[PDB]
Design a protein around this ligand. Structure first.
Ligand SMILES: NS(=O)(=O)c1ccc(C(=O)NCc2cccc(F)c2F)cc1
Ligand SMILES: [Hg+2]
Ligand SMILES: [Zn+2]
Length: 258
């Protein structure tokens, strides 16, 4: 039926309706730190999120997305392995039912409690729709979340989760500053990949940050109270909405640090 993360419609079944699931540049992948190549030609990332305009937060049945106004160059990602300007359109997370799992990407097989994805599209393509038809159409900034001290900047997100508990629900979510979700260091690993959820399009340049951000146990607990189901349907907790690591195949993971 429609794709999900359950036993009968999960990642292992996606290939039936989306053959690209078994493609050549699928994400996420395991990042082997000893095989990753330090590339001195990689420029530092340039995250310019000061003019960011968040609009709303929505439970889409797979995760919750915080959407941004991308009609202009308000919040952009440049530099790093990218050529051109990429506009922030939305961010979301993937998390587990327990603290020891939840991230999509892993580092030396280590799984983190969750993973934040800041989605950006290449402006030379005009709109998000055209960008997903190009090999360099998207750039997703990935950040790992480990359970420890609370992250102040994530609280506004946590507090609003009650209003979007079920699939289809949305709430206004203006003036959110995404800079509060960034770690201190912008060191990263980068490799060409895909969306981690159907349609699994291979249009993404992944930029995974080395330094994870820490959030509290209470903060992550709030994520786990969301529902995959719509209002009135039987309750299915939204947990474990992550895709397991895929074969790296003919790709090399480059590091911006040594
Ligand atoms: N987890 S992740 O960062 O890799 C990821 C990022 C974006 C999307 C997305 O935009 N999906 C909807 C979608 C996809 C293609 C075309 C569309 F029109 C559309 F709405 C999905 C997964
Ligand atoms: Hg593509
Ligand atoms: Zn994602």
């Amino acid at each position: 039926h429609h794709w999900g993360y359950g036993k009968h419609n999960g990642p292992e079944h996606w290939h039936k309706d989306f053959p690209i699931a078994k493609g050549e540049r699928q994400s996420p992948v395991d990042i082997d730190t000893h095989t990753a190549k330090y590339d001195p030609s990689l420029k530092p990332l340039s995250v310019s999120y000061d003019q960011a305009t968040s609009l709303r937060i929505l439970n889409n049945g797979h995760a919750f997305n915080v959407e941004f106004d991308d009609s202009q160059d308000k919040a952009v990602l440049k530099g790093g392995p990218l050529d051109g300007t990429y506009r922030l359109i939305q961010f979301h997370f993937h998390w587990g039912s327990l603290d020891g799992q939840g991230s999509e990407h892993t580092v030396d097989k280590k799984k983190y409690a969750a993973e934040l994805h800041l989605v950006h599209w290449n402006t030379k393509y005009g709109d998000f729709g055209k960008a997903v038809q190009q090999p360099d159409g998207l750039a997703v900034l990935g950040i790992f979340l480990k359970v420890g001290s609370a992250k102040p900047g994530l609280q506004k997100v946590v507090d609003v989760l009650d209003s979007i508990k079920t699939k289809g629900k949305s709430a206004d979510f203006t003036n959110f500053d995404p800079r509060g979700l960034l770690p201190e260091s912008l060191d990263y690993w980068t490799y060409p990949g895909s969306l981690t959820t159907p349609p699994l399009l291979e249009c993404v340049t992944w930029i995974v940050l080395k330094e994870p951000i820490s959030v509290s146990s209470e903060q992550v607990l709030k994520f786990r109270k969301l529902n995959f189901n719509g209002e009135g349907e039987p309750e299915e907790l939204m947990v474990d909405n992550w895709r397991p690591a895929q074969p790296l195949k003919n790709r090399q993971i480059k590091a911006s640090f040594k």
